[PDB]
Amino acid sequence: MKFQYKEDHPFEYRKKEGEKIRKKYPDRVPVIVEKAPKARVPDLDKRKYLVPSDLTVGQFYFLIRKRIHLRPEDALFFFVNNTIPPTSATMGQLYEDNHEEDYFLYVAYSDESVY
Amino acid sequence: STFTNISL
C-alpha cells in the first residue's frame, strides 16, 4: 500500500511499539494516517495517532478532513486494507478487524475513491 | 517517537 511509516520503521520495531501501546491504553488504538500515493490533497502534519476506541470511523473521517483543511465541498475517502471502511464502526472495531501484524491500524486518505 | 493524541 506504500505507507512511509513502514518505509521508515523496521517491522520488529513497529510490532514492539504496537504491542506495548495496545497493552498500555486499552481504550485507545494506534493508527497511522497517510495520504495515498498520487492524492491531490495536503499531507497531514502528523502521521502517528492514538485514537479513542469509541470514536466512530465517520467522526475520525470528519476530523481528518479538518486537519488537512479540506473545504466541505471537496472529496475525500478513507482506505483500510484497500477498502473504504464502514463509517458506523468504532475505531476500536476497525482496529480489531484490520490491524496488521505489527499491531498498528493503517488508514490512507485520497481525493479519489480508488486507492 | 510520540503519538498524537486525538481527544474524544
Side-chain angles (χ1 to χ4, degrees), chain A residues 3-11 13-15 17-19 21-22 25-26 28-37 39 41-44 46-111 113-115, chain B:
Chain A
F3 283 82
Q4 193 64 42
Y5 191 80
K6 293 189 196 180
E7 294 289 333
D8 290 352
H9 292 83
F11 172 80
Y13 179 99
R14 297 194 324 257
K15 178 173 184 292
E17 184 166 52
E19 287 183 332
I21 218 77
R22 263 259 78 176
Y25 298 100
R28 309 178 198 175
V29 290
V31 186
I32 303 308
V33 184
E34 294 192 29
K35 187 177 67 65
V41 288
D43 274 333
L44 278 165
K46 301 297 176 179
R47 67 183 174 185
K48 188 163 78 179
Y49 296 87
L50 202 47
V51 182
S53 294
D54 291 334
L55 189 66
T56 68
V57 169
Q59 288 176 291
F60 190 59
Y61 169 75
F62 289 122
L63 179 146
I64 293 296
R65 288 181 62 101
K66 288 179 178 82
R67 292 291 173 91
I68 68 176
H69 320 119
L70 206 65
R71 288 175 310 183
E73 298 82 19
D74 291 338
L76 201 73
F77 308 91
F78 278 173
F79 299 89
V80 175
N81 295 316
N82 215 1
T83 305
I84 297 178
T87 52
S88 297
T90 66
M91 289 295 291
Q93 290 174 320
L94 193 70
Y95 177 94
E96 286 302 316
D97 196 32
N98 288 275
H99 70 86
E100 296 199 358
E101 308 96 306
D102 67 357
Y103 294 95
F104 278 84
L105 174 65
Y106 293 81
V107 178
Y109 62 91
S110 182
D111 59 324
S113 48
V114 179
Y115 181 76
Chain B
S1 169
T2 78
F3 286 82
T4 291
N5 266 268
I6 296 300
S7 49
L8 199 49

